[PDB]
């Protein structure tokens, strides 16, 4: 059997969301987007990961539930929710999949605010893991980001979580920056040449050097850096130093010989309340039953 899993990551920048966040749910915007045909099919599982979320726990889940209801005309059932100050993750499933969910667990790890929130459950015989984080900010603090990851990986009681679930998803504001000057970054962005920028992306570099996210996978990035935008539009980056970077990412680690296909991976361009652009990721996951 096949199920559609949606993963959303968005640093809200300590402000409430706009009334229209439809593009985030429907993988509409820039990068690897879902086509106008595939968007009509509602996803089986919706996973929302947020950082710098000023909206209260109950009020935020109501907005997601209400937002999904206006889009799909379906009353999505919240399975789990874990919050750590302004970092919060929520998992909602199709009402028909209620009896298919078992062994629900939640955990939170505080760093240095900063840290992570986790959610884990089982869809029939297939186990799932979801980690929403907010790592240390700053271009020169890559060492702290690597330490933050290793700390969450060993303290999140959801022996290591890297081999605990059939499909493990790690997402959030990882805060990894570009190892390049502002002159070159804005010159490449103006020509929409993201490949030379992605070669000096700190997360891509630390993964290639096998420092962090061992045997983890990430879909190709074809969308512009999601940080740091001027609020109210997506036309200009607020750099003056916070150079444009791919801070918001979705990664996955799956068990060998399992079915997992990434259908979309990108960002929206119509949600402008935050200095961060929301990031989406959809997947076709195989379930044993």
Curated annotation (Swiss-Prot):
PTM info: Tyrosine phosphorylated by the members of the SRC family after exposure to a diverse array of extracellular stimuli such as insulin, growth factors such as EGF or PDGF, chemokines, integrin ligands and hypertonic and oxidative stress. May be phosphorylated upon IgG receptor FCGR2B-binding.
Stated induction or repression of this protein's expression: By bacterial lipopolysaccharides (LPS).
On the tree of life, the source organism's domain of life is Eukaryota
- Leader sequence range is none
Q: Where in the cell is it found?
A: Cytoplasm, Cytosol; Cytoplasm, Cytoskeleton; Membrane; Cell projection, Filopodium
What is known about the tissue distribution of this protein?
A: Widely expressed, most prominently in skeletal muscle, heart and brain. Present in platelets. Expressed in transformed myeloid cells and in primary macrophages, but not in peripheral blood monocytes.
Instruction: Tell me the impact of changing residue 173 to A.
Output: Abolishes enzyme activity but not phosphorylation upon FCGR2A clustering
Also noted in the record is: Its ability to confer resistance to dietary obesity suggests that it may serve as a possible therapeutic target in cases of type 2 diabetes and obesity.
What does its UniProt record remark on the domains?
The SH2 domain interacts with tyrosine phosphorylated forms of proteins such as SHC1 or FCGR2A. It also mediates the interaction with p130Cas/BCAR1.
Annotated disease: Genetic variations in INPPL1 may be a cause of susceptibility to metabolic syndrome. Metabolic syndrome is characterized by diabetes, insulin resistance, hypertension, and hypertriglyceridemia is absent.
Q: What does this protein do?
A: Phosphatidylinositol (PtdIns) phosphatase that specifically hydrolyzes the 5-phosphate of phosphatidylinositol-3,4,5-trisphosphate (PtdIns(3,4,5)P3) to produce PtdIns(3,4)P2, thereby negatively regulating the PI3K (phosphoinositide 3-kinase) pathways. Required for correct mitotic spindle orientation and therefore progression of mitosis. Plays a central role in regulation of PI3K-dependent insulin signaling, although the precise molecular mechanisms and signaling pathways remain unclear.
Question: Which protein family is named in the record?
Answer: Belongs to the inositol 1,4,5-trisphosphate 5-phosphatase family.
Subunit architecture: Interacts with tyrosine phosphorylated form of SHC1. Interacts with EGFR. Upon stimulation by the EGF signaling pathway, it forms a complex with SHC1 and EGFR. Interacts with cytoskeletal protein SORBS3/vinexin, promoting its localization to the periphery of cells. Forms a complex with filamin (FLNA or FLNB), actin, GPIb (GP1BA or GP1BB) that regulates cortical and submembraneous actin. Interacts with c-Met/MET, when c-Met/MET is phosphorylated on 'Tyr-1356'. Interacts with p130Cas/BCAR1. Interacts with CENTD3/ARAP3 via its SAM domain. Interacts with c-Cbl/CBL and CAP/SORBS1.
User: What is this protein called in UniProt?
Assistant: Phosphatidylinositol 3,4,5-trisphosphate 5-phosphatase 2
What is the species listed in this Swiss-Prot or TrEMBL entry? Answer: Homo sapiens (Human)
**Segment of the intact protein contained:** 422 to 731 of 1258
């Amino acid at each position: 059997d096949m199920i559609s899993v949606f993963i959303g990551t968005w640093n809200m920048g300590s402000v409430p969301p706009p009334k229209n966040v439809t593009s985030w749910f429907t993988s509409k915007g820039l990068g690897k987007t879902l086509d106008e045909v595939t968007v009509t099919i509602p996803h089986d599982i919706y996973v929302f990961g947020t950082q710098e979320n000023s909206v209260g726990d109950r009020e935020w889940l109501d907005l997601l539930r209400g937002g999904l209801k206006e889009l799909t005309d379906l009353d999505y059932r919240p399975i789990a929710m874990q919050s750590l100050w302004n970092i919060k993750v929520a998992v909602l499933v199709k009402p028909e999949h209620e009896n298919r969910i078992s062994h629900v667990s939640t955990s939170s790890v505080k760093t240095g605010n900063k840290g992570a929130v986790g959610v884990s459950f089982m869809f029939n015989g297939t186990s799932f893991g979801f980690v929403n984080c907010h790592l240390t900010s700053g271009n020169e603090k890559t060492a702290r980001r690597n330490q933050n990851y290793l700390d969450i990986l060993r303290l999140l009681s959801l022996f290591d979580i890297s081999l605990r679930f059939t499909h493990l998803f790690w997402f959030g504001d990882l805060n990894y920056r570009l190892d390049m000057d502002i002159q070159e970054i804005l010159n490449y962005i103006s020509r929409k040449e993201f490949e030379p920028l992605l070669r000096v992306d700190q997360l891509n570099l630390e993964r290639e050097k096998h420092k962090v996210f061992l045997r983890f996978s990430e879909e190709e990035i074809s969308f512009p850096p999601t940080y740091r935008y001027e609020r109210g539009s997506r036309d200009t980056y607020a750099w003056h130093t916070n150079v444009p970077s791919w801070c918001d990412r979705i990664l996955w680690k799956s068990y060998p010989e399992t079915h997992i296909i990434c259908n979309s991976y990108g960002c929206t361009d119509d949600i402008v309340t935050s200095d961060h652009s929301p990031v989406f990721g959809t997947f076709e996951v195989g379930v044993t039953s």
